[PDB]
From Swiss-Prot, chain C:
The gene is Atp6v1c1. This is V-type proton ATPase subunit C 1. It is found in: Cytoplasmic vesicle, Secretory vesicle, Synaptic vesicle membrane; Cytoplasmic vesicle, Clathrin-coated vesicle membrane. Expressed in brain (at protein level). Belongs to the V-ATPase C subunit family. It comes from Rattus norvegicus (Rat). Subunit of the V1 complex of vacuolar(H+)-ATPase (V-ATPase), a multisubunit enzyme composed of a peripheral complex (V1) that hydrolyzes ATP and a membrane integral complex (V0) that translocates protons. V-ATPase is responsible for acidifying and maintaining the pH of intracellular compartments and in some cell types, is targeted to the plasma membrane, where it is responsible for acidifying the extracellular environment. Subunit C is necessary for the assembly of the catalytic sector of the enzyme and is likely to have a specific function in its catalytic activity. V-ATPase is a heteromultimeric enzyme made up of two complexes: the ATP-hydrolytic V1 complex and the proton translocation V0 complex. The V1 complex consists of three catalytic AB heterodimers that form a heterohexamer, three peripheral stalks each consisting of EG heterodimers, one central rotor including subunits D and F, and the regulatory subunits C and H. The proton translocation complex V0 consists of the proton transport subunit a, a ring of proteolipid subunits c9c'', rotary subunit d, subunits e and f, and the accessory subunits ATP6AP1/Ac45 and ATP6AP2/PRR.
Swiss-Prot record, chain D:
It is found in: Cytoplasmic vesicle, Clathrin-coated vesicle membrane; Cytoplasmic vesicle, Secretory vesicle, Synaptic vesicle membrane; Melanosome. Coiled coil: none annotated. V-ATPase is a heteromultimeric enzyme made up of two complexes: the ATP-hydrolytic V1 complex and the proton translocation V0 complex. The V1 complex consists of three catalytic AB heterodimers that form a heterohexamer, three peripheral stalks each consisting of EG heterodimers, one central rotor including subunits D and F, and the regulatory subunits C and H. The proton translocation complex V0 consists of the proton transport subunit a, a ring of proteolipid subunits c9c'', rotary subunit d, subunits e and f, and the accessory subunits ATP6AP1/Ac45 and ATP6AP2/PRR. Interacts with SPAAR. The modification Phosphothreonine is found at residue 85. This is V-type proton ATPase 116 kDa subunit a 1. It comes from Rattus norvegicus (Rat). Subunit of the V0 complex of vacuolar(H+)-ATPase (V-ATPase), a multisubunit enzyme composed of a peripheral complex (V1) that hydrolyzes ATP and a membrane integral complex (V0) that translocates protons. V-ATPase is responsible for the acidification of various organelles, such as lysosomes, endosomes, the trans-Golgi network, and secretory granules, including synaptic vesicles. In certain cell types, can be exported to the plasma membrane, where it is involved in the acidification of the extracellular environment. Required for assembly and activity of the vacuolar ATPase. Belongs to the V-ATPase 116 kDa subunit family.
From Swiss-Prot, chain E:
Expressed in brain (at protein level). The keyword Ion transport applies. This is V-type proton ATPase subunit E 1. It is found in: Apical cell membrane; Cytoplasmic vesicle, Secretory vesicle, Synaptic vesicle membrane; Cytoplasmic vesicle, Clathrin-coated vesicle membrane. Keywords: Acetylation, Cell membrane, Cytoplasmic vesicle, Hydrogen ion transport, Ion transport, Membrane, Phosphoprotein, Synapse, Transport. The keyword Cell membrane applies. One of its GO terms (molecular function) is ATPase binding. The modification Phosphotyrosine is found at residue 53. It comes from the Eukaryota. One of its GO terms (cellular component) is extrinsic component of synaptic vesicle membrane. It comes from Rattus norvegicus. Its main location: membrane. Belongs to the V-ATPase E subunit family. The chain holds residues 4 to 57 of 226 of the full protein. The gene is Atp6v1e1.
Length: 57, 163, 103, 131, 54
């Protein structure tokens, strides 16, 4: 019936809303991971050149 | 002459629609010769985008119809003395226009399939619009050459008042 | 000096011009077909050369045959002009998606 | 918040032609409903009573909307505003109930006021004329 | 028919759902290049600061 089908459509759009929300969540998580991973590699480099600086000393 | 493209939406597997439209239909009555067009797998976008395209491609067809008619008209206006068997002089490809169209397939070399339809149409439009401009330049140039020659003919024409 | 080269250039021009026109015709056919017959895409399109005096019976049978492929509880029979809005229709409605080439 | 939704009113015997128009212009991608109005109602511009119907249209994008709504206007269908949720339906229903009740009250009152003032003038107008 | 009407509805549900699929997928793919660009940005900037001080 038309009413039931269209209500099922409202459900379909709520599904679409869920999908887009999932996309945004993935993006935020991935961006945060990028930030942290870059910071950690930076820490590795910082310590490495600290060590080389002390060796030259 | 005239040809038609029809969707033939498979009805599940290909044969069930395609052969029902070709063999069953022509066996019932040979009202038309039938062949396979084999639409490519162009990447489908959003519904809103495709609805907009439903008008985009209407306008594009209405424009390129005039473009190709212009090409034919200028071909005839330059080769008037040998315009006979028109489509043979004009032929785009193949031995004959019917042979080309009955074997038409999407050209990956000009526009590869992987792109979006918006991009593919945009590059098509670039091609055809540059073609239109180059027609308006070069065929007009040859017409101007004919005009110069005809003005020389006018110089030759008439009594010595003109000559 | 110029007779030959512009005739040949027009030949070359028409090659790509016509090929692009058929590209466009295919694009229109495909888009309308997807919009009509929802996802997935199942369009193994047909090319017809109508034979002499065949149009009437041919379209009659084809239109009748497409009524159980496309729903016929709407449209089809008649409609007013559609000037208001984004676009006004360029074509009739058939339960088959159709376009034409003037070869 | 990605489905397009509208509702309005349209006359009888216009409904199937309207459906055909919509399903021909936005084929296989828009939908509509129709239902009666009890008793005929007055037309605003023409000024005569006629039977009416509620209708709904559902659409999926603005490219479709720019066909559908302007086609409704071409059919001279009337939409007016509509609620977003059932709570907004309650809000709008209470608002329109109150406002149409107020308009009916002041309409009766103003027509009776016209009667009153017109009789006040008519009580002596003939003497006004001759004077 | 109501059967064809609900088939139409199923179709447009499929359309909107695949549209959401494409939107989410492209947002995630762009999140990949944001991942890349942020990695480059932060590594480069902190690298430059450390390099200057050292």
């Amino acid at each position: 019936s038309q009413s039931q089908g269209i209500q099922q459509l409202l459900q379909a759009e709520k599904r679409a809303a869920e999908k887009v929300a999932d996309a945004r969540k993935r993006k935020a998580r991935r961006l945060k991971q990028a930030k942290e991973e870059a910071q950690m590699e930076v820490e590795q480099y910082r310590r490495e050149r600290e060590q080389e600086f002390q060796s030259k000393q | 002459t005239e040809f038609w493209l029809i969707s033939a939406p498979g009805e599940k597997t290909c044969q069930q629609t395609w052969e029902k439209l070709h063999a069953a239909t022509t066996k019932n009555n040979n009202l038309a010769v039938s062949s396979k067009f084999n639409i490519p797998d162009l990447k489908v976008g959003t519904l809103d985008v495709l609805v907009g395209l439903s008008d985009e491609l209407a306008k594009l067809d209405a424009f390129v119809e005039g473009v190709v008619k212009k090409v034919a008209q200028y071909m005839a206006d330059v080769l008037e003395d040998s315009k006979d068997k028109v489509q043979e002089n004009l032929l785009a490809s193949g031995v004959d226009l019917v042979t080309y169209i009955t074997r038409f397939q999407w050209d990956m070399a000009k526009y590869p399939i992987k792109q979006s339809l918006k991009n593919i149409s945009e590059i098509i439009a670039k091609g055809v619009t540059q073609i239109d401009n180059d027609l308006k330049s070069r065929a007009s140039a040859y017409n101007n050459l004919k005009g110069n020659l005809q003005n020389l003919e006018r110089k030759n024409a008439g009594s010595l008042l003109t000559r | 000096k110029q007779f030959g080269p512009l005739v040949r250039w027009l030949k070359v021009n028409f090659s790509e011009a016509f090929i692009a026109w058929i590209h466009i015709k295919a694009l229109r056919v495909f888009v309308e077909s997807v919009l009509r017959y929802g996802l997935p895409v199942n369009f193994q399109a047909m090319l017809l050369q109508p034979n002499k005096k065949s149009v009437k019976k041919l379209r009659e049978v084809l239109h009748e045959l497409y009524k159980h492929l496309d729903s016929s509880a709407a449209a089809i029979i008649d409609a007013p002009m559609d000037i208001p809005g984004l676009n006004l229709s360029q074509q009739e409605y058939y339960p088959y998606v159709y376009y034409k080439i003037d070869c | 918040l990605r489905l397009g939704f509208v509702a309005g009113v349209i006359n009888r015997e216009r409904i199937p032609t309207f459906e055909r128009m919509l399903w021909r212009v936005c084929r296989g991608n828009v939908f509509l409903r129709q239902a009666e109005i009890e008793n005929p109602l007055e037309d605003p511009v023409t000024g005569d009573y006629v039977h009416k119907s509620v209708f709904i249209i559902f659409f999926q994008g603005d490219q479709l909307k720019n066909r559908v709504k302007k086609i409704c206007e071409g059919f001279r269908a009337s939409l007016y505003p509509c609620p977003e949720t059932p709570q907004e339906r309650k809000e709008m229903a209470s608002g329109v109930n109150t406002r149409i009740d107020d308009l009916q009250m002041v309409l009766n009152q103003t027509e009776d006021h016209r009667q009153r003032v017109l009789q006040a003038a008519a009580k002596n107008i003939r003497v006004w004329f001759i004077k | 028919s109501d059967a064809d009407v609900q088939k139409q509805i199923k179709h447009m549900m499929a359309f909107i759902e695949q549209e959401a699929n494409e939107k989410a997928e492209e947002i995630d793919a762009k999140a990949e290049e944001e991942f890349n660009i942020e990695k480059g940005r932060l590594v480069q900037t902190q690298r430059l600061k450390i390099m200057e001080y050292y």
